Amino acid sequence: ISASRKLQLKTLMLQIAKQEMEREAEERRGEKGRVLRTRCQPLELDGLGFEELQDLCRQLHARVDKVDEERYDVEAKVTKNITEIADLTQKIYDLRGKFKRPTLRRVRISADAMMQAL
Amino acid sequence: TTALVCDNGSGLVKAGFAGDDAPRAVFPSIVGRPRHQGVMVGMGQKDSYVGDEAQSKRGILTLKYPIEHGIITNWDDMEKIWHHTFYNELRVAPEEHPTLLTEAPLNPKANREKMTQIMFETFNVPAMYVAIQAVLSLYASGRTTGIVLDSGDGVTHNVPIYEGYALPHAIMRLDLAGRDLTDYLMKILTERGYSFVTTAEREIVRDIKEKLCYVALDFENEMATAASSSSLEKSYELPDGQVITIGNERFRCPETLFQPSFIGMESAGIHETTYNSIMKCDIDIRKDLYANNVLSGGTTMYPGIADRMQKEITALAPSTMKIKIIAPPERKYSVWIGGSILASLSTFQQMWISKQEYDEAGPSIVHRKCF
Amino acid sequence: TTALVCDNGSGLVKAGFAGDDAPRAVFPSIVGRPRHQGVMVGMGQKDSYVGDEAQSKRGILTLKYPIEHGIITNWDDMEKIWHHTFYNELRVAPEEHPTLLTEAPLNPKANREKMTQIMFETFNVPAMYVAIQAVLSLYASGRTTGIVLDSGDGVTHNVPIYEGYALPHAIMRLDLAGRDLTDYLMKILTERGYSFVTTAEREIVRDIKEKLCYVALDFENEMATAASSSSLEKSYELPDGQVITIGNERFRCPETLFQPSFIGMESAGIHETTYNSIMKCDIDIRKDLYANNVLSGGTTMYPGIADRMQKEITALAPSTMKIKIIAPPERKYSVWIGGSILASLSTFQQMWISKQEYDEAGPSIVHRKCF
Amino acid sequence: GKRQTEREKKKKILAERRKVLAIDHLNEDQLREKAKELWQSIYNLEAEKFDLQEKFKQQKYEINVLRNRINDNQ
Amino acid sequence: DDIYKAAVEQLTEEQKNEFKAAFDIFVLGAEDGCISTKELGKVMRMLGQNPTPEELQEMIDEVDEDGSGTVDFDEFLVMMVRCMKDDSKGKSEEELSDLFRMFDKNADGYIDLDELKMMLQATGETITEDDIEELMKDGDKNNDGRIDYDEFLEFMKGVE
Numbered sequence A: 001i002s003a004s005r006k007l008q009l010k011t012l013m014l015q016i017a018k019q020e021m022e023r024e025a026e027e028r029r030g031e032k033g034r035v036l037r038t039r040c041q042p043l044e045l046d047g048l049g050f051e052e053l054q055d056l057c058r059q060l061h062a063r064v065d066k067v068d069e070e071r072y073d074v075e076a077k078v079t080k081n082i083t084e085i086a087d088l089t090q091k092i093y094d095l096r097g098k099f100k101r102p103t104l105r106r107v108r109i110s111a112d113a114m115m116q117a118l
Numbered sequence B, C: 001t002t003a004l005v006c007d008n009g010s011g012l013v014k015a016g017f018a019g020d021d022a023p024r025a026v027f028p029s030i031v032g033r034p035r036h037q038g039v040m041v042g043m044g045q046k047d048s049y050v051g052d053e054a055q056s057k058r059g060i061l062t063l064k065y066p067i068e069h070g071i072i073t074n075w076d077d078m079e080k081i082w083h084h085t086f087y088n089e090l091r092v093a094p095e096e097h098p099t100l101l102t103e104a105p106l107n108p109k110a111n112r113e114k115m116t117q118i119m120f121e122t123f124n125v126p127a128m129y130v131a132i133q134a135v136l137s138l139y140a141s142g143r144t145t146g147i148v149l150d151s152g153d154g155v156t157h158n159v160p161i162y163e164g165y166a167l168p169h170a171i172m173r174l175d176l177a178g179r180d181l182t183d184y185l186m187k188i189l190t191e192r193g194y195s196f197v198t199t200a201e202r203e204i205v206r207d208i209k210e211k212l213c214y215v216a217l218d219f220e221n222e223m224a225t226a227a228s229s230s231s232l233e234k235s236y237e238l239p240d241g242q243v244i245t246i247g248n249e250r251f252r253c254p255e256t257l258f259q260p261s262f263i264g265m266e267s268a269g270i271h272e273t274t275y276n277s278i279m280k281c282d283i284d285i286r287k288d289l290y291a292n293n294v295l296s297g298g299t300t301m302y303p304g305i306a307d308r309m310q311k312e313i314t315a316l317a318p319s320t321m322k323i324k325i326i327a328p329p330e331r332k333y334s335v336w337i338g339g340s341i342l343a344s345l346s347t348f349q350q351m352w353i354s355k356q357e358y359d360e361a362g363p364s365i366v367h368r369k370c371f
Numbered sequence D: 001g002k003r004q005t006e007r008e009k010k011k012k013i014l015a016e017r018r019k020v021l022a023i024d025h026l027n028e029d030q031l032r033e034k035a036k037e038l039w040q041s042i043y044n045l046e047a048e049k050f051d052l053q054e055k056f057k058q059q060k061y062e063i064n065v066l067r068n069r070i071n072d073n074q
Numbered sequence E: 001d002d003i004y005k006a007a008v009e010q011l012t013e014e015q016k017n018e019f020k021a022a023f024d025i026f027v028l029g030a031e032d033g034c035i036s037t038k039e040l041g042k043v044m045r046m047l048g049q050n051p052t053p054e055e056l057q058e059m060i061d062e063v064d065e066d067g068s069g070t071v072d073f074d075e076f077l078v079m080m081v082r083c084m085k086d087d088s089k090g091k092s093e094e095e096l097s098d099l100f101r102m103f104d105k106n107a108d109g110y111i112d113l114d115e116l117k118m119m120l121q122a123t124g125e126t127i128t129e130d131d132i133e134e135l136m137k138d139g140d141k142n143n144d145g146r147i148d149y150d151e152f153l154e155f156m157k158g159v160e
């Protein structure tokens, strides 16, 4: 079989991969910005009195506590599921890679070129 | 940087950089002072030839191994051997390279502590780690279980391992090895007229043992055959002529491994200490150990040993279990290949005994967590 | 959504979604930490193998059941077992599924309250309900009356029920079960020379008990026959060879059920605690209980028990009543099948302990109306 | 493993180990600064939890690959 | 393809020394390259390269296309350089996993060889006999009806 086909296939697959990388990165940037905008409510520089300032400030304090509790909870969930993912990674690696671990070597490199020693 | 995988051994020092297939420099570990007077002036005669240089001038030297049975009995000579190994056979200063020595199981503590103290004070390495000679031989086979019989030249030890968990209560260390076989061969050669006495002629007897001896599949039948026919008598040319003919001394020298009563040792052969080492293990991992028996070390290179040992164990073991004996062709350097693999691992990179740790706890750090 | 019908048990955890015929995942409930040192680096060795994984590496573990006699003695291990059951054997997050645990009768309150607190705080289920292990076994038989003898592996309990009205004053709970039979078998095997001591070899003795032991129809005649002929001696191959031959230990191990004086227990056998449980009931429902005696649980799977028990009860009971012993072939999973049926009912759908109710009354809600 | 320790740790992060603080007790410009600071910190936390959700999806996909590989490997 | 032409243009002199040493060792004077595949294998082993015996067999069976033994140093040199290892492990496994995550539009823990075909079809590139069949054959090399993650790895591992 010609390896030129594999080279062309790898060029096309590399183009696919880079396009999908940039596309997903851009989409994630847009979604992130949109979510932050619709969730991080902007602060207003005018239109509220000092009493209104205090009222809205305490309202935002309560909201900050609520969503901080929520995000800490989901962060803890991420941590636990990440521990689980690591454990399962070790499990499946022992399932598969327990045979391949010793295979990692760079062999017969220098000693094969030592015929002039004697 | 790269790590230095040294392997002191007893009889051949094997060293080389981590990550290769074979040791870079392999040379006998003997240090021989000259014994005669010396009349030529200015010949440039040194006071001690070490390594492979003393195997060429052995006619006028008194070679003496610095390692008797695993343990080191002459620390100055061992320091000289290490200095030679680092500077002339590898030509890499030790100030810029981690080292990974190897040590037999059940050895005296003082030996290991002195070894680490030398490596940290005299040669001044960045970090050194000491590993048991059998776990490496298990690495090289690419297994993770199995009971490995590492019959070196100094000491034969038999470490069983399961799923990576070594069983410290089942290690059976026996002090019969290649050197005792050399002495016994030198002692039975006298039955034909050939007398080797000098410490230099021990090397000639060792060469005879390596090139001619083999392990008999069945001892009595071979003894009967060699006593009637003459199809076994193989001849060998000494370093000066006068060929010699070895008769039934061929398979009687390595038979001592399976009957240590020949050299007066009480214990049982290497065929029965493996079965005893297995039977000390738990009842549920005996099948795996039976199926993954590993051979290593130099002395297990006799032609026909992987069949004799299998026959013996099959005789001892229950009839249902399958007995398999792993005998890779690269047996001699199996320990060093395993050492290279272990030193090349990323997970192992934080187990070295760093120098600052030694400065804080003294040489007794080796027995601590950094094993 | 669908409900999770878990069934902790003691010896085998049986779980699966509601509405099926058999539990999806059945695996021993043992958590075993490794006990040796471990020399291979990077092998990926975990700190505790639970479930069916620790029945394959049991050669180097120390298995320990987290449930002794119905009650739970080691809450961390039980939490680990539940976590494994939910995430790896069923792969369904508990945040979206009601659960239906099962509990033996007459158990300590604190056990049940801690169970519900764990299920609501750690795993955070939507709603959980705890049911008595005998009512489910009565569901599975498709009856509505009858006295059920649920001889599990932890505890044997005997709950009589009539027309759906349980009789709380007639429950006779006895703590002899499969585990004590395993220990007694392991203790009488020593009379032939076979010694099993390690907690791993208890599993081997359990396998011997399951595959060979049977309940004798008449004890003295069997003892006399086994002492003269040799038609009973059945052999069995250990996990490494060395077959063993079990003589009259075959029917002496499960005979302990009908004579608990063998293991030093005072109480009467399972043949007489059923009759006592019946006689505590009212005089007008004794015929129905006599005719609908139900067997369940694992330990009632011995070959020939449904005849010995019937003979014994017929001896005890009045001669006119008909004694019938229901022994379905799906005895082992009878409790879980009944649990699935109960969880699949529409009338039962409003009996779950909803989470908001727990938030308002604390863990002591389980003893309240939502039983 | 003493789930009481886990519960108390979670509660402390919920109320004590988190930067929980009464702040609406200040003068005008300072109160504005503090409200903006807390709101922006919470917005950063929004970005963090959004990334947590994304990576949680990724880990779910990885565990799906895990199950598929295991089922295909046995 | 054009990659071979580019490799010809980027003639690495360090390996060019050894390849012209092979030129000299083989050609004993005005030799038109009779292609001694035994000499080819001896050179390959001698020059420090590690050719698999199957690689040398392919060399034996993919030479003398002229029929006269005389093979142009151009095509022979291209064959020799390509049979020589010129690659760096073919990207990273982390890259492979991330890109396969990109490719799992099915979101089912893998992709499909049909999905692979459609994705490469989206590239607007020519599919021919060299293409099409073996693409799906080796993408789902185990032939599960869908390309598993490890199947995706094995499809193009060690290729840039």
Ligand SMILES: Nc1ncnc2c1ncn2[C@@H]1O[C@H](COP(=O)(O)OP(=O)(O)O)[C@@H](O)[C@H]1O
Pocket: B008, B009, B010, B011, B012, B013, B151, B152, B153, B154, B178, B179, B182, B206, B209, B210, B211, B297, B298, B299, B301, B302, B332
């Ligand atoms: N090909 C061989 N045949 C028989 N015996 C051998 C052979 N090679 C080495 N030996 C014996 O093994 C010894 C070398 O063992 P070795 O594995 O180097 O010991 P160490 O464990 O100290 O390195 C030599 O002394 C020799 O007696």
Ligand SMILES: Nc1ncnc2c1ncn2[C@@H]1O[C@H](COP(=O)(O)OP(=O)(O)O)[C@@H](O)[C@H]1O
Pocket: C008, C009, C010, C011, C012, C013, C151, C152, C153, C154, C178, C179, C182, C206, C209, C210, C211, C297, C298, C299, C301, C302, C332
């Ligand atoms: N086929 C069998 N023959 C004899 N005894 C059995 C058999 N199967 C299981 N057992 C015994 O029953 C026990 C399992 O009982 P089980 O019903 O699982 O208990 P639980 O009520 O905790 O689920 C095992 O420990 C074993 O001793």
Ligand SMILES: [Mg+2]
Pocket: B009, B010, B133, B150, B152, B153, B297, B298, B335
């Ligand atoms: Mg050795």
Ligand SMILES: [Mg+2]
Pocket: C009, C010, C133, C150, C152, C153, C297, C298, C335
């Ligand atoms: Mg039960």
